[PDB]
Amino acid sequence: KKTLWELVGRNKDALRDFLKEHRGTILLRDIASEHKVVYKPIFKRYNGDPDLIEDNSNDVEHWYDYHLERYWNTPELKKEFYKKFGPVDLNQPIILAKPLRQHNRGDLVHLLPQFVVPVYN
Amino acid sequence: KKTLWELVGRNKDALRDFLKEHRGTILLRDIASEHKVVYKPIFKRYNGDPDLIEDNSNDVEHWYDYHLERYWNTPELKKEFYKKFGPVDLNQPIILAKPLRQHNRGDLVHLLPQFVVPVYN
């Protein structure tokens, strides 16, 4: 697909490398939400790696379900959702990020690589 | 076309007072990008003063170099760029602004006063 998780072929080390390589330019758009917010990933002041939460399949499942339920909530929309994104990848990490919108100083979000596309890749 | 930073005497309190005085009648066109998009100056969350960033001249250099490399990245264009804008002024604040409609980079941009010209209504 065109999502970040497919672009790195479902591999957390490659995801971490990808984000690290484009630290100064990289933005992510949620395409699983109706309101196409673009987000700036958070990086760790130290080693310069992205701030990822690894191995929390519980939170992954929640975010996955949350989107399906909020935005793709009809039998029809549901078949397309699954066509676009596939079944949940419980092994993906969660990316720490802030939405590019006004007054975003506090705002942290958890994004699934499965649901985001790089801007400008 | 005289830039905002020139019009306010390269003084950062002068810049703040200018955006306060013209609130509601000025927009800002980014003239350092290929597409010269017009944005609206963001005012502080519960608002009198413009939402500027004044403490970070590494972010100033980042945005100045960013446009140079993206948009003026031939020998010819780099000359025209420099002749037009001059060296980066590290004393300038960063202007938080938002697009007038849905934008590929999201709904918040950082604009250099050195790279923008006012658009009046």
Instruction: Measure CA A90 to chain center.
Output: 13
Token pair of A83, please?
């066509």
Q: Which resolution in angstroms does this entry have?
A: 1.9
Q: Give the number of A-B residue pairs with CB atoms closer than 8 Å.
A: 36
Handedness of CA A8, A19, B39, B114 (dihedral sign): negative
The string of DSSP letters for A97-108 reads: EEESSSS-SS--
Domain ranges of chain B: 1-121
Question: Which chain B residues touch A101 with a CB distance below 8 Å?
Answer: 98, 106-108
Token pair of B39, please?
């944005």
Token pair of B42, please?
């963001």
Token pair of B58, please?
């590494």
Contact A38/B at CB under 8 A = yes
| Stretch (H or E) spanning B38 | strand B38-41
Q: Is there a contact between A36 and B102 if contact means CB atoms under 8 Å apart?
A: yes
What contacts B59, CB < 8 A, 6 or more positions away?
B53, B94, B110
What contacts A43, CB < 8 A, 6 or more positions away?
A19, A20, A23, A49, A50, A51
CA A33, CA A112: separation in Å to the nearest integer?
A: 12
Question: Which chain B residues touch A100 with a CB distance below 8 Å?
Answer: 105-108
Question: Which chain A residues touch B108 with a CB distance below 8 Å?
Answer: 100-102, 104
| Stretch (H or E) spanning B27 | strand B26-30
Q: Is there a contact between B106 and A39 if contact means CB atoms under 8 Å apart?
A: yes
Distances (CA, A) of A99 to A107, B46, B86, B104: 7, 19, 32, 13
Number of C-beta neighbours around residue A66 at 10 A: 13
CATH T-level fold of A1-121: Cathepsin B; Chain A (3.90.70)
Cα of first residue to Cα of last residue in chain A, in angstroms, is 13
